[PDB]
């Protein structure tokens, strides 16, 4: 009725702070893993050049 | 009973009709004449365009049909022919050089080109050994565009020829063409890399000599005749009939071709 309740009450703030920090850490890790994937595709100029060669020009 | 396979590659209908009339009138119906697009034996191909299924494009100067201008000349022109795909698809001769620029992998194409060059080189050296010449002349177009196909062609042709023990002299397209038309007695065996310009040079030599029939060696193993004009086609048919085992008919066609080039069918 008296002791354990008081110590739980004393615990509450630190645990709340640590859990908030942990959630912020999770969000930070989520953000840090995001990278934009710029792909490179075969230039169509080569395709045009091949087309010209096939024509025997 | 027997069959002669006619292939058409860029040939006008008049030449094909003339060839059909010649064979029908000379053969007499004993051997049928069917038309197709690919064959390995008993085949005559009409037209400048290269058919599908041929790896070597040898041509010589037959003694019987020597023009008076080119009497006594003896030079063998062998053109290496890479495998031919469908007209829409990109040809190997162009794919081998453009894919490298584009960065695409070119392993299988290189392997196929290497096999074709080795076969062509083996044919060329065999002709050179048979004729007794010690050095052959490689012909490669020196255009910057064809800086990869020719490089492989030289790397392989010289390797095979040197392995056989003969010498190789590399040259371009314009100089060799002028020499072959003006002073052909200074060249014994000339190999040509697979390019459009080389194909035109081979046709020009086959025509300037007086009209001859080119021999194509196919993947399946064999020889098929090739012509582009009335006289050349007539000679090609005569050789084909000779191969089937007809001597008198072949001689008659050859005589008719010598006398009346453009109207052999009526001449005989």
Question: What 3-state class would DSSP assign to B167?
Answer: strand
Non-local (6+) Cβ contacts of B122 within 8 A are: B160
Backbone angles phi, psi at B119, to 5 degrees: -65, -45
Q: How many angstroms away from the CA of B91 is the closest CA of chain A?
A: 7
DSSP-based helix, strand, coil % in chain B, nearest 5: 45, 20, 35
Q: Helical H runs in chain A?
A: 3-32, 44-54
Query: Rounded to an integer, what is the distance from CA B71 to the centroid of its chain?
Result: 21
Mark out chain A residues that contact chain B at CB-CB < 8 A.
Answer: 42-43, 46, 49-50, 53-54, 56
Q: How many angstroms away from the CA of A53 is the closest CA of chain B?
A: 7
- The span from the CA of B43 to the CA of B223, in Å, is 8
- The span from the CA of B151 to the CA of B153, in Å, is 5
Contact assessment for residue B186 and residue B72, using Cβ atoms and an 8 Å cutoff: no
Resolution in A: 3.7
Q: Which residue has the tokens 């063998």?
A: B76
- How many residues are listed for chain A in this entry? 57
Q: What technique was this entry resolved by? A: cryo-EM
Task: For chain B, give the residues followed by a break (C–N over 2.5 Å).
Answer: none
Considering all CA atoms of chain B, what is the largest pairwise distance in Å, rounded to the nearest integer?
58
Contact assessment for residue B210 and residue B97, using Cβ atoms and an 8 Å cutoff: no
Contact assessment for residue B16 and residue B37, using Cβ atoms and an 8 Å cutoff: no
Non-local (6+) Cβ contacts of B200 within 8 A are: none
Contacts of A50 in chain B (CB under 8 A): 90, 94-95, 98
Nearest C-alpha neighbor of B27 from the set B259, B240, B215, B232: B240
* Crossing angle between the packed helical segments B149-164 and B92-102, to the nearest 10 degrees: 120
- The span from the CA of B219 to the CA of B54, in Å, is 6
Question: What 3-state class would DSSP assign to B32?
Answer: strand
Contact assessment for residue B190 and residue B78, using Cβ atoms and an 8 Å cutoff: yes
> What sign for the dihedral angle of Cα B248, B252, B257, B259?
positive
- The span from the CA of A12 to the CA of A17, in Å, is 9
Backbone angles phi, psi at A14, to 5 degrees: -65, -45
Q: Which residue of A has its CA nearest to B87?
A: A54
Contacts of A54 in chain B (CB under 8 A): 90-91, 94
Contact assessment for residue B59 and residue B187, using Cβ atoms and an 8 Å cutoff: no
Query: Using the beta-carbon criterion (under 8 Å), do A46 and B91 form an inter-chain contact?
Result: no
Contact assessment for residue A1 and residue A9, using Cβ atoms and an 8 Å cutoff: no
């Amino acid at each position: 009725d008296i002791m354990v309740p008081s110590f739980v009450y004393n615990k509450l703030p630190v645990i709340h702070f640590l859990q908030e920090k942990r959630a912020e850490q999770k969000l930070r890790r989520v953000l840090d893993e995001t990278y934009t994937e710029w792909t490179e595709e075969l230039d169509q100029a080569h395709v045009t050049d091949a087309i010209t060669r096939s024509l025997n020009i | 009973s027997k069959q002669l396979t006619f292939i058409s590659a860029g040939a006008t209908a008049a030449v094909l009709q003339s060839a059909s009339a010649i064979v029908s009138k000379v053969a007499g119906g004993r051997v049928q004449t069917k038309t197709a697009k690919e064959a390995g034996r008993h085949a005559v191909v009409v037209g400048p365009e290269t058919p599908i299924g041929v790896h070597t494009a040898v041509t010589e100067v037959p003694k019987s049909a020597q023009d008076p201008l080119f009497s006594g000349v003896s030079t063998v022109v062998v053109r290496a022919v890479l495998p031919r795909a469908a007209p829409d698809s990109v040809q190997l001769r162009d794919a081998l050089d453009v894919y490298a620029s584009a960065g695409i992998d070119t392993k299988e194409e290189v392997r196929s080109a290497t096999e074709a060059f080795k076969k062509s080189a083996e044919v060329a050296v065999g002709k050179a050994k048979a004729k007794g010449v010690k050095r052959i002349v490689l012909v490669v177009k020196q255009a910057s565009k064809h800086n990869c196909i020719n490089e492989l062609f030289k790397k392989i042709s010289t390797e095979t020829i040197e392995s056989a023990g003969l010498t190789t002299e590399v040259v371009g397209t314009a100089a060799v063409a002028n020499q072959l038309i003006v002073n052909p007695e200074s060249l014994g065996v000339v190999l040509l890399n697979d390019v459009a310009a080389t194909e035109q040079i081979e046709l020009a030599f086959a025509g300037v000599v007086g009209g001859v029939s080119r021999v194509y060696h196919t993947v399946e193993g064999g020889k098929i005749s090739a012509g582009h004009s009335f006289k050349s086609v007539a000679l090609a048919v005569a050789q084909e009939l000779r191969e089937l085992g007809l001597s008198s008919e072949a001689d008659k066609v050859e005589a008719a071709a010598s006398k009346n080039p453009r109207a052999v069918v009526s001449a005989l």
